[PDB]
Design a protein around this nucleic acid. Sequence first.
RNA 1: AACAUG
RNA 2: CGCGGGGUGGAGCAGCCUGGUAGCUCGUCGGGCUCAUAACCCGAAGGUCGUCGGUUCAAAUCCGGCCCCCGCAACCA
RNA 3: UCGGUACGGUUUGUGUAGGAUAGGUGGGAGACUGUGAAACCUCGACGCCAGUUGGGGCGGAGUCGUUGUUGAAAUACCACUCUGAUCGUAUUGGGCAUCUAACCUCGAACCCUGAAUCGGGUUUAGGGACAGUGCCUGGCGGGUAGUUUAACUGGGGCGGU
RNA 4: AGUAGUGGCGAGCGAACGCGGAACAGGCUAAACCGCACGCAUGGGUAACCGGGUAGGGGUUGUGUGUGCGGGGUUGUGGG
Lengths: 230, 62, 47
Amino acid sequence: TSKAYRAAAAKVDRTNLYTPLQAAKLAKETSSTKQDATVEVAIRLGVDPRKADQMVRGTVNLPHGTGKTARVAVFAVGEKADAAVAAGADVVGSDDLIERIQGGWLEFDAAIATPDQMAKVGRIARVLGPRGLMPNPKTGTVTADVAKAVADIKGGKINFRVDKQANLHFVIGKASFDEKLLAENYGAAIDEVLRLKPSSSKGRYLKKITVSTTTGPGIPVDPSITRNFA
Amino acid sequence: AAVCDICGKGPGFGKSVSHSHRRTSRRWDPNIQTVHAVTRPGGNKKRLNVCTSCIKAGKITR
Amino acid sequence: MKLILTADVDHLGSIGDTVEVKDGYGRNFLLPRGLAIVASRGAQKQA
RNA sequence: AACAUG
RNA sequence: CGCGGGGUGGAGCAGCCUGGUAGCUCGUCGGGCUCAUAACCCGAAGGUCGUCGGUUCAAAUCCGGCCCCCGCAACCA
RNA sequence: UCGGUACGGUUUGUGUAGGAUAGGUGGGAGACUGUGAAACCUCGACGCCAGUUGGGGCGGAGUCGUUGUUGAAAUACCACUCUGAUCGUAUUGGGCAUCUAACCUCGAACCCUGAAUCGGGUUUAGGGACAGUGCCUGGCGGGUAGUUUAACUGGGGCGGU
RNA sequence: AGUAGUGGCGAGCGAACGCGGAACAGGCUAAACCGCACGCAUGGGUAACCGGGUAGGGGUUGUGUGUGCGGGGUUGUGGG
Ligand SMILES: [Mg+2]
Ligand SMILES: [Mg+2]
Ligand SMILES: [Mg+2]
Ligand SMILES: [Mg+2]
Ligand SMILES: [Mg+2]
Ligand SMILES: [Mg+2]
Ligand SMILES: [Mg+2]
Ligand SMILES: [Mg+2]
Ligand SMILES: [Mg+2]
Ligand SMILES: [Mg+2]
Ligand SMILES: [Zn+2]
């Protein structure tokens, strides 16, 4: 109320556009007084998500990770569970896994369902609604190759999906990361958005972008720099 | 009027072209305005027809 | 066009200096009444 | 406001 | 060709800018009311919400797909 | 006197269970003088769903929220958005009303003028940035103009082709 | 050369570059600036000017600008 709002205008300025060098710098200076946080990047695209052919959805790999625990639940039995027991599946259960989740146990950060289990995991996806824990074949979580699917979560491969009002929101890593671990994540962030530009888009594509945190203010960032993030 | 009393700029004739490219004759008339001009400050006023490209310069006084 | 005004004109400026005028306030009011002159040679008569 | 018949 | 509106029960229409009941009037049947008949009042019957396919917890309402209808503008193989 | 544009500030929204599903997405789960809309007092609509957390004019002398769970459900924080309202900055544009000096007067008097219901010039009484005209532009336009209105056909016309 | 092209690319319309001849020729002004007159302004040792310098004297006709008439000027290797 008092300290958090007065800490905004002492460092950043609204009208002054900031470089991607200075944005990650102020991301280290804003979150230093409070605890650690996730440096949030909000992207305002110039497409309409209401048209289904202009729908933007894809993946993007963070080579420096994001600092996430990644409790990956794997829905597999038999030799499909043997392909993930060496991949890093922490909880390998049985056919009663339908009943353990409905009892009040939702302690997993990722859900990977094999196609041999998709007739039974579909009863679990109702309680996994708002927090975003249901298995999705469009994001690469429903496949027969679950050995490489565990390492996709541990590397921090973010699955982005544009909202109702064309405002992307993207994470790059924790506040404990350096100025170059976040910038190379931010350097590979915008370019994969430009590769995921739709076909029939008009106007200016990446109009507004900013850098924010969990419990702090934002950073005005200039889309003019798409080449020199390093 | 359509003749400037100073520079002699009269009208020009041309054609008015439609969408079916039917050409008929119209006339480009100059922007002739009336002025009450003096020859020395405080003297009498003579009425003239001048064009607006001479009022924009200093060919007359008022 | 620019002018050099001689007398005191309100909301327009002081005396001696040049001023911007909107070309119809000049030759209808300022120039026939003698309150202003054109600025071609008057910049040296002012100096 | 309301209706009229045998 | 471009803009932005319209389609709902046997008939005539609300509801659509705010996603959730889907209705009212007329007509058909049956019942009330009256000494009795008209007039009146009520219930029930009657819905592919023009069609499909997605968004979506959920669509008559939002977006596209065609299907007929209309308004204004366009229309130099 | 009004309006939209970029940006900034505040505020607005929602079913039976919940600070009425933050309205929506994405992050993230402890933040600061919050007594209590008892007061001095909170809205301009919301006072219907549901009473809003500001009109902080105050009491600052202390503490709420983040922890429990339920429709799908989170509830502090807090993000940049959506609908409506408002303030401020900057820019741009349109109405309405006074002024006189461009312009207009078939209003008047005087003079050129000896003979002038023409014309011009001077003074005065009024209209006034409107009208009229030039250029560019949309409409309306048998008022007017140039032309078109096919062929077969037991004759042309009607049907048919 | 009825060529390049141009055309309800219909009917049609229609160049130039260049080569061969006929005939040959080039001249004045405006402006900058310096004077004279007229017109306006500014100023009385504030200051100059009186052909330049040299010295004094004059003891205000200097200084600036507007309008005509003389001087100066006429170029593409740029000329003034
Ligand atoms: Mg004449
Ligand atoms: Mg001609
Ligand atoms: Mg002709
Ligand atoms: Mg011109
Ligand atoms: Mg002008
Ligand atoms: Mg005719
Ligand atoms: Mg003819
Ligand atoms: Mg016949
Ligand atoms: Mg020759
Ligand atoms: Mg000369
Ligand atoms: Zn003229």
